[PDB]
Every structure is written in C-alpha cells, then in structure tokens.
C-alpha cells in the first residue's frame, strides 16, 4: 500500500521492490573429522612424526573435551525431561537439536567402526547420512607413499612433518560455532562437493553465501582415536508469497530558510496487510530477493506508518546537523532537489530557476531539455516518466533537547498553578 509517487513531495525516495526468502526447515548431516591419516604399507615411515603430531594435538583437543563436559544440559534423557535451572526459548531449540543427536549415536558408532582402517579421503554412508574426511590423506596418497621409492624414509618423513605442522597451524584458527567456510577451505575446498547428494545442487551464488554464515556445533570428542563430530544444518530456502521489501533514503527539506529531513529506517517491508520496517544486518542481498535467518520485521511508530501509506501530513521532521543528508537526487529521468541550497540553472548557466520560499522541494520533469545543478550539466531522459503542504509534527532525536523541553514544561505549569 506504499504510494511512491506521492512521497516524493517530501523528499522520500523508495527503491524498486524485491522479494524475501526464509528458511524454516533444515536438513541434518553429520561430519566426522578423523585427524590422524593412514599410510598403507610404508613399513612404519612417519611414526615418529605422527607421535609429535599427537602431542601437538593434545593441546587443542584436551581443553575441548573438558569444555564439552562442563556445559549444562537443558533436557535430560515425549522428547525428554526439563532439567533444573533457567533456559529460554532460543536455548530450547538448540537443546532439542542436540537431543536428536543422541538418536543417531548407534548409527554413527557403526560408520566409525567401518572406517577404522581405510585409505579414502572422503567417504559417505547413508542408511541418517554420514560423511567422514581424514586429515591430509589425499596429499599422502598422492605424493608421500609414492615418494618412498626414490628419496627414502628421511626426506619423506621431513615432508610429512612439514605438512602436518602446517595442518596444525591451519587448525587453531577455526577451533580457537566453528564457521562452515573455515572448515570447507581447510580440508580441500568447495561446499557442493562434501555434501555430494543433497539439496545443495539447487543453489544459486547468493544461496551459497547464506549457508557459509551458519555455524556448526561440536557434539563429541574421542581422545582415544582423535576425532571431532560436527552437526551441520543445511537450509531449505522457500520464497514467501505476497511479500515485498523496499529501500528508503531522504534528502534535505527546506522550511523558512533552513534544512530539515524526514527520519525513516533504512528499509521498509510489506507482507500481506502488515506494513513495517525490516532490518537486514544479518540478511544477504540478492538480485531478486533477500535471504533472512528469521523474519526481520519490527513494528514502526503509528505516525511513521500513516506517512508511508500515502498520508503526507503525518510525517515527522527533524533538523539537519551534518552534511550526510544529501540535497539532490535523480528520481526518474529528472531531478528532485532543494534549489535554495543548490543552484538550479538548468537550460543555460545564465538561466536560473528559484524555488519560492513557501515550497520545499523542486521537481523538474521535459520542462527544460538539460539541467545543471552546481557546475555539471545533465540531459534528461525521455524514455522515463515523472510528474510535477504542512508537516507540523517536528521531533528531536537528542536526549538533551528533550530534557530541556521537559524542564520548560515543568516550569510552565508551576507558573500556571502559582
């Protein structure tokens, strides 16, 4: 119900629309990260370098296990029992998600037993789907096991040690939420390759960005065979219906020799009959719509709604206190600007057009072929379109001004009762 053409009279410009995409259902997959590679039949070449790798790993794996145990439990195992202490709605969802992990403990145990002794870097079993990546196994099989025929065990061991120390350094930057992007680039690369068979196939470039922002959760550590079990919740993005999102910016408004502007949020939203603002700090912009983890709408002030729904008289205004608020804009094949602050010689530099004192902004359509604002001359566009009042709801956005006005009121009624 936004009236874009009417709003221009008071300097509010609304960008072209876009849709919104939200994720409500998640697909659960498990990612076992075995950190000790295997060398097939190398006569125990690399054993010494593996031991040092284990000592180095114990620094980052023993604290991680201890932190896991100290974590409280919202639900103790109908889903389960409530437990003692305080926990809010946002924590109950994570608690339920973790409870779902205990149901697949038996199946995960089976997969780990199967992959105990194997040489494959990536391997998946689905009865429920599991995926297991082994430290730097690809590099080993490709350039270390072959390497021990021409160089010997010494050079191969030195190369293995350098590789493993570099791998340890790359670790401790993701495990210092572990962030999905950190995991993906670490092992080999990609995100559509790890989850070969899944919905990731039907993902655009913007969709892949949203998944990389999701955080994974550690749900087990072994300390006997060095492994970390992670739970990944990939999203299913479904576009909502009858939803639009715009963008709003404002320009200077002139009242009696001064500068004002109409303060509005960064974005405006309209879903169904609900008209209100929307924050996109955690969302991702795309070419056709947004992607938001949760509904961003937040209720605006009533006057702000009446203003945005075409009723100009109810918009509020404030004082300009900086140079951030602009003074001219290209609306549609024309300009809307405050001709008092900025010059408005349109057709020829000598020619000038003055906005009358009563009016606030000047809309030029067609009317004159070329327009120059300050020193630059522009030509209008005819393929486009365009067309050619009291606010009295002023406000102040600084607490000191409010306090002084309040003190004035306090003093005024005392004068009244006296």
């Amino acid at each position, epitope marked *: 119900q936004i009236d874009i053409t009417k709003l221009q009279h008071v300097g509010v410009l609304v960008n072209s629309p876009k849709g919104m995409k939200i994720s409500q259902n998640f697909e659960t997959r498990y990612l076992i990260l075995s950190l000790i590679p295997k060398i097939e039949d190398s006569n125990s070449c690399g054993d010494q370098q593996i031991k040092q790798y284990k000592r180095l790993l114990d620094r980052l794996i023993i604290p991680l296990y201890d932190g896991l145990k100290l974590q409280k439990d919202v639900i103790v195992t109908v889903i389960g029992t409530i437990a003692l202490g305080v926990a809010t709605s946002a924590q109950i969802t994570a608690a339920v998600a973790l409870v779902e992990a205990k149901q697949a403990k038996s199946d995960i145990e089976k997969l780990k037993e199967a992959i105990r002794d194997t040489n494959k870097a990536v391997q998946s079993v689905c009865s429920n789907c599991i995926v297991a990546i082994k430290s730097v196994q690809d590099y080993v099989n490709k350039e270390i096991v072959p390497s021990i*025929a021409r160089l010997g065990c010494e050079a191969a061991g030195l190369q293995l040690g350098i590789a493993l120390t570099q791998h340890y350094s790359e670790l401790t930057n993701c495990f210092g939420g572990i962030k999905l992007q950190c995991i993906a680039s670490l092992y080999r690369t990609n995100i559509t390759e790890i989850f070969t068979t899944s919905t990731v196939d039907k993902y655009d470039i913007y969709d892949l960005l949203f998944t990389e922002s999701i955080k994974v959760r550690v749900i087990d550590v072994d300390l006997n065979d060095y492994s970390i079990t992670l739970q990944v919740r990939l999203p299913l993005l479904t576009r909502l219906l009858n939803t639009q999102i715009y963008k709003v910016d404002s320009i200077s408004y002139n009242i009696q020799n001064r500068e004002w502007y109409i303060p509005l949020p960064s974005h405006i939203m309209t879903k169904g009959a609900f008209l209100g603002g929307a924050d996109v700090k955690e969302c991702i912009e795309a070419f056709s719509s947004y992607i938001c983890p949760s509904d961003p709408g937040f209720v605006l002030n009533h006057e702000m709604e009446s203003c945005l729904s075409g009723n100009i008289s109810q918009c509020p205004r404030t004082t300009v206190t900086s140079d951030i608020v602009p003074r001219y804009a290209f609306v549609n094949g024309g300009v809307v600007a405050n001709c008092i602050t900025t010059t408005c010689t349109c057709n020829g530099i000598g020619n000038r057009i003055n906005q009358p004192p009563d009016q606030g902004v000047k809309i030029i359509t067609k009317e004159c072929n070329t327009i120059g604002i300050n020193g630059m001359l522009f030509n209008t566009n005819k393929e486009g379109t365009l067309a050619f009042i009291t606010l009295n709801n002023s406000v102040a956005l600084d607490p000191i001004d409010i306090s002084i006005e309040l003190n004035k009121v306090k003093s005024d009624l005392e004068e009244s009762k006296e």
Partner: antibody
Amino acid sequence: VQLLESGGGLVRPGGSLRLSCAASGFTFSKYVMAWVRQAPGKGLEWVSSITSGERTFYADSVKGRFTVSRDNSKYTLDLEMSRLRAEDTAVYYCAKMFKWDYDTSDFGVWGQGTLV
Amino acid sequence: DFQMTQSPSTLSASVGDRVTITCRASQSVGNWLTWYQHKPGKAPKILIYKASTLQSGVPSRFSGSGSGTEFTLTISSLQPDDFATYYCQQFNTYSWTFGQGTRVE
C-alpha cells in the same frame, strides 16, 4: 627365526630356475623381505624386494628378467628367473628388512643362502 | 642417487689396540644404518642394526654411534680371529646400497 634353502645348482645359460627360501618362527606377515647377491670374490649387492601387498621393486641389472612372489598363508618366499646370463653367478640370500622405528621387538635375520 | 664410501680400505692392527672405521653418506640417510660382519665362507651377520642398538649375542667390545651423514663404529680391544671384512648398509629407500669393505687384520 629360521630360513631355508632351495634351488641351488647349475643351469645352462638362458635357463630358468625357482629358488624358494621358507620362513618359520615369527610374524612373517608384517615385514618386507628382499634378496641380496654376492658375486664370488666381490662386494655385496642388491637384487629385488617385495613388501606385504606384492607391490615389488627391482635392481636395474635384473629388471624385466626375474619375478618375486610371496605366500603369506604358508610363510614362504619364492624367486623365479629367466633369460639367465653369465654375470649372475653368485650366492643368493633371503633377508628381512627392519621397521622404521626403535621398538625392541625387531630382531633381524639372515638366510643361509644358496650357491647357484 | 644415494652413495656410500668408507675409509680406510685396508688396515693394520694388533691384539688389544683400537680401530676406527668410517662410512660417509653422499646424502642424508639419517639414523637408518646397519653394520654387517662378513667372513669368508660364512653368511653375513648383524652387529649394530640401527647405528646404536647392539644385537643379541654380539660382544660388548663393538660400540657404534653417530648420525646424519657421517657415522662410525669403533672397537675397544681386538680378538686375533675377529679381523674380518665389515660393511655399512643404508635402508632409507626400498633400494639398499653398501660400501667397499675394510680388511681389519
């Protein structure tokens, strides 16, 4: 910790032979065994090697001529030769290769050898 | 590519003296060596099978130590019938190599 002899004898140039050294008395299925040559009145030398998995490795001078195979189930290691030449008159040894670790369980053994 | 050479090729000695036998590696073979005693008519034996460890049954007079490229094994006192040939092999690569030999006498 015992190794046997077999096949030591005289053959005509261009013949073919099958030397088998049989082992018993340790865990044979977790070690790499290799052959070693000693020309009479000359320094020692290497012939070939076989790992647990039958990958196989050979000395250049005998490449493409000899074959090495091992029987893990029966604890036996066999060698066959073809296109024999005059230079290959020596004493042949079947040996065990040390692991690349310092564990005290490793011993090291040396076959008695055939005088072919 | 790895090569081994040892000096002295020939030695003179007498019972009770001390003898030092070197073995220089062309490249880095590491702590992967072994010293064999070869006597005419007998199959070679193993003396020090990792450059440090003494094989069971070997006499204590054989002391061996070293690392990197240079290695060494030294005898404290001789036995008249222990003047045999001695070898320094390398098992760094699946493909072994030997030295020349040393007639201790």
